[PDB]
Design a protein around this ligand. Structure first.
Ligand SMILES: *[C@@H]1O[C@H](CO)[C@@H](O[C@@H]2O[C@H](CO)[C@@H](O)[C@H](O)[C@H]2NC(C)=O)[C@H](O)[C@H]1NC(C)=O
Ligand SMILES: *[C@@H]1O[C@H](CO)[C@@H](O[C@@H]2O[C@H](CO)[C@@H](O)[C@H](O)[C@H]2NC(C)=O)[C@H](O)[C@H]1NC(C)=O
Ligand SMILES: *[C@@H]1O[C@H](CO)[C@@H](O[C@@H]2O[C@H](CO)[C@@H](O)[C@H](O)[C@H]2NC(C)=O)[C@H](O)[C@H]1NC(C)=O
Ligand SMILES: *[C@@H]1O[C@H](CO)[C@@H](O[C@@H]2O[C@H](CO)[C@@H](O)[C@H](O)[C@H]2NC(C)=O)[C@H](O)[C@H]1NC(C)=O
Ligand SMILES: *[C@@H]1O[C@H](CO)[C@@H](O[C@@H]2O[C@H](CO)[C@@H](O)[C@H](O)[C@H]2NC(C)=O)[C@H](O)[C@H]1NC(C)=O
Ligand SMILES: *[C@@H]1O[C@H](CO)[C@@H](O)[C@H](O)[C@H]1NC(C)=O
Lengths: 170, 106, 50
């Protein structure tokens, strides 16, 4: 609040304007970064109420209705595990909307495959989507269909191991 | 990476201190519902599409390519056999035509 | 206002139904990328002292 200091500071010119403009550019760049990463869909997709995906379990990655934050158990664990003229501007997208964007992406990739990223969301059963992905890596569809229960069990076990590994590693 | 949709090709255009890419992409349109199955059970054998997907318009079963609706008769030429019908969950019963069958008959 | 994220779409998922496209659209989109800047040179001695 010293007026003599500001009068002497005016001799240095527009340094303050350059610092403010650089910080403003960084601040809008952060919002642009979040927009580029998470806002890749303009349709908010939802999963069906019945979670019949041919044995595949997505409860650890789908949003939890019991939590007020509407986050997945993995996302809830991730958010718990991260801990003079100065102002902190809030981000343009709140954590709830970023969680909503991830929920829309998860619902699109579960119910529609990769079709929603290239156009309209075309529904496909998840054991058929998985077979298509198996054909993408050069494995025949029969291998997926014959061993569908084992693949679903392995996927569920791996997702549980992911949650345990995040909860157990500092 | 090269536009929204299934990328077909791209055109470069010069711009002042920059480049403009005209991305020509293929977007699916006018989608329609069909009843689908993982496999077709015929003669105690499980048939899977070689390159397409089994679809049903309500009464009849066909095989079509995945990204465009083009129904074709389920034959041995466009399906492959792996195992019996007891393992695949959701296998349905339908006939599988054999192109060679009228040939040895005549 | 509180900004909307997108239009709400519910995908009609079931374990035995698929959606197959019957038509297509040839879509051309623009992507603008900067390549270079203006090449500026500053004579340090002339700028500071003339
Ligand atoms: C999907 O996975 C969840 C989590 O692994 C399963 O929920 C568990 O269910 C068992 C018995 O039903 C309980 O003993 C556990 O405590 C539950 N865990 C959690 C985190 O809720 C769920 O049963 C699985 N299947 C379906 C269809 O949702
Ligand atoms: C599903 O498609 C098939 C073939 O495109 C339809 O079967 C044909 O229907 C026409 C119209 O009645 C008949 O003239 C043909 O003889 C039928 N073909 C055969 C092999 O029987 C069938 O009607 C369609 N089903 C629905 C519900 O649209
Ligand atoms: C699909 O076709 C198979 C083969 O005709 C059916 O399996 C037979 O079903 C009868 C009646 O239940 C049994 O007596 C036979 O022993 C079965 N044969 C075999 C090899 O399993 C099957 O039931 C049909 N499924 C549908 C939904 O029509
Ligand atoms: C495929 O069928 C489903 C249900 O038979 C259609 O989904 C319904 O669409 C109407 C109109 O938009 C909605 O009012 C319903 O709420 C939807 N139901 C469900 C369960 O999602 C779907 O539109 C059909 N797809 C096509 C391409 O016609
Ligand atoms: C696929 O879509 C195209 C347009 O995207 C359809 O072409 C139109 O057909 C109508 C009636 O025949 C004409 O009046 C329009 O002028 C056509 N548009 C263009 C751009 O040519 C085409 O008929 C559709 N095909 C199917 C099988 O649905
Ligand atoms: C789909 O679910 C129904 C029960 O609602 C079941 O009868 C049918 O066999 C299932 N189909 C597949 C392919 O899992």
């Amino acid at each position: 609040d010293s007026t003599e200091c500001s009068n002497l500071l005016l001799q240095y010119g527009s340094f303050c304007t350059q610092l403010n403009r650089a910080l403003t550019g960084i601040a809008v760049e952060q919002d642009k970064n979040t927009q580029e990463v998470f806002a890749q869909v303009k349709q908010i997709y939802k999963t069906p109420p019945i979670k019949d995906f041919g044995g595949f379990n997505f409860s650890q990655i789908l949003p939890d209705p019991s939590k007020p934050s509407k986050r997945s158990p993995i996302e809830d664990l991730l958010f718990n595990k991260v801990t003079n003229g100065l102002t902190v501007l809030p981000p343009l997208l709140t954590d709830e909307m970023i969680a909503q964007y991830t929920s829309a992406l998860l619902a699109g990739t579960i119910t529609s495959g990769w079709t929603f990223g290239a156009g309209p969301a075309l529904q496909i059963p998840f054991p058929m989507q998985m077979a298509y992905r198996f054909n993408g890596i050069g494995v025949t569809q029969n291998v997926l269909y014959e061993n569908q229960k084992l693949i679903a069990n392995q996927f569920n076990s791996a997702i549980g191991k992911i949650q345990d590994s995040l909860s157990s590693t500092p | 990476f090269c536009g929204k949709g299934y990328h077909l090709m791209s055109f470069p255009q010069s711009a002042p201190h920059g480049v403009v890419f005209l991305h020509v992409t293929y977007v699916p349109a006018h989608e329609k519902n069909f009843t689908t199955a993982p496999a077709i059970c015929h003669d105690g054998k499980a048939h899977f599409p070689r390159e397409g997907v089994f679809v049903s318009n309500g009464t009849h079963w066909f095989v079509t390519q995945r990204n465009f609706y083009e129904p074709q008769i389920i034959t041995t030429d466009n399906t492959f056999v792996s195992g019996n019908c007891d393992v695949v969950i959701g296998i349905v019963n339908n006939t599988v035509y054999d192109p060679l069958q009228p040939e040895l008959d005549s | 206002y509180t900004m909307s994220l997108g239009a709400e779409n519910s995908v009609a998922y079931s374990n035995n139904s698929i959606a197959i496209p019957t038509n297509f659209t040839i879509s051309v989109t623009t992507e603008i990328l900067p390549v270079s800047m203006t090449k500026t040179s500053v004579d340090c001695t002339m700028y500071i002292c003339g």
